[PDB]
Paper text:
[name]-2 family proteins are crucial regulators of the mitochondrial apoptotic pathway and are characterized by the presence of up to four conserved [name]-2 Homology (BH) domains. [name]-2 family proteins are divided into 3 functionally distinct groups: (i) the pro-survival proteins ([name]-2, [name]-XL, [name]-W, MCL-1 and BFL-1/BCL2A1/A1), (ii) the multi-BH domain cell death effectors (BAX, BAK, BOK) and (iii) the BH3-only apoptosis initiators (e.g. BIM, BAD, NOXA). Dynamic interactions between members of [name]-2 family subgroups, involving binding of the BH3 domain of the pro-apoptotic members to a groove at the surface of the pro-survival proteins, control commitment to apoptosis. The pro-survival [name]-2 members exert their function by sequestering pro-apoptotic members through binding to their BH3 domains.
Here we describe [name] (also known as BCL201), a novel, orally active [name]-2 specific inhibitor that has a partially overlapping but distinct [name]-2 hydrophobic groove binding mode compared to ABT-199. Fluorescence polarization (FP) data, using Fluorescent-PUMA as a binder, demonstrates that [name] is a potent inhibitor of [name]-2 (Ki = 1.3 nM). The selectivity of [name] for [name]-2 versus [name]-XL ranges from ~70 to 400 folds depending on the assay used. No significant binding to MCL-1 and BFL-1 was observed. [name] occupies the region typically referred to as S1/2/3 in contrast to the ABT-199 analog, which occupies a greater portion of the protein surface area including S2/3/4/5. [name] adopts essentially the same binding mode as described in Porter et al. 2009. [name] forms a single hydrogen bond to the backbone carbonyl of residue A149 buried deep into S2. The size-independent enthalpic efficiency (0.83) for [name] binding to [name]-2 is suggestive of optimal polar and Van der Waal's interactions, indicative of highly specific binding. Since ABT-199 and [name] have different binding modes, one can theoretically speculate that mutation(s) in the [name]-2 protein could cause resistance to one compound and not the other. Altogether, these data demonstrate that [name] kills cancer cells through on-target activity, meaning activation of a BAX/BAK-dependent mitochondrial apoptotic pathway by direct inhibition of the [name]-2 pro-survival protein.
Residue numbers in the entry: 7 to 35, 48 to 50, 92 to 203
């Protein structure tokens, strides 16, 4: 199947933020299994690297004017050597962490921007690989 990558991003971020006590109203609402499997994969990745995640918080020092550069720098590093599902999970978890950090640092408007930046990058740079590699349904089989 083929999905709406914007919807995948928005659902992923909205859930992560709602869990943590922020209702992201600007971003409020086979597909179902994709959303759930991606969330669980990201949570597994967060657990797997729990202490590196904890530590990362201090590394980024986000501000509105630097946030895009900080985001893009990491995304470029993640995919410099090509695409695979692991790096896609890392990309979703990184975006989600950036949204949580934006809320925590009293910069909640950045959530909307991060969601856009993630969607643009999926659209432009990852979708061909996803489609070629069996789509999100292949991800579900591999991670489910
Ligand atoms: O710089 C990064 C980062 C995270 C990964 C990464 C991606 C993966 C993965 C693995 C790692 C990884 O390399 N780590 C995971 C991790 C997780 C959380 C925080 C830091 C790190 C760094 C190291 C952990 N080390 C690796 C060597 O052995 C000891 C543990 O398996 C599947 O996909 N990679 C990078 C940079 C480029 C190589 C891969 N972040 C980053 C971003 C901002 C600031 C600092 C680091 C980043 C990117 C995406 C994320 O979801 C989270 C982190």
């Amino acid at each position: 199947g083929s999905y709406d990558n914007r919807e995948i991003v928005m659902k992923y971020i909205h859930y992560k933020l709602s869990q943590r006590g922020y209702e992201w109203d600007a971003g409020a609402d086979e597909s179902e299994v994709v959303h759930k499997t991606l969330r669980e994969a990201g949570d597994d990745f967060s657990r797997r690297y729990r202490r590196d995640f904890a530590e990362m918080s201090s590394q980024l020092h986000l501000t509105p004017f630097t946030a895009r550069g900080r985001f893009a720098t990491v995304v470029e590093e993640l995919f410099r050597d090509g695409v695979n599902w692991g790096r896609i999970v890392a990309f979703f978890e990184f975006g989600g962490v950036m949204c949580v950090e934006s809320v925590n640092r009293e910069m909640s408007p950045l959530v909307d921007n991060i969601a856009l930046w993630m969607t643009e990058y999926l659209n432009r740079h990852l979708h061909t690989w996803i489609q070629d590699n069996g789509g999100w349904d292949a991800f579900v089989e591999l991670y489910g």
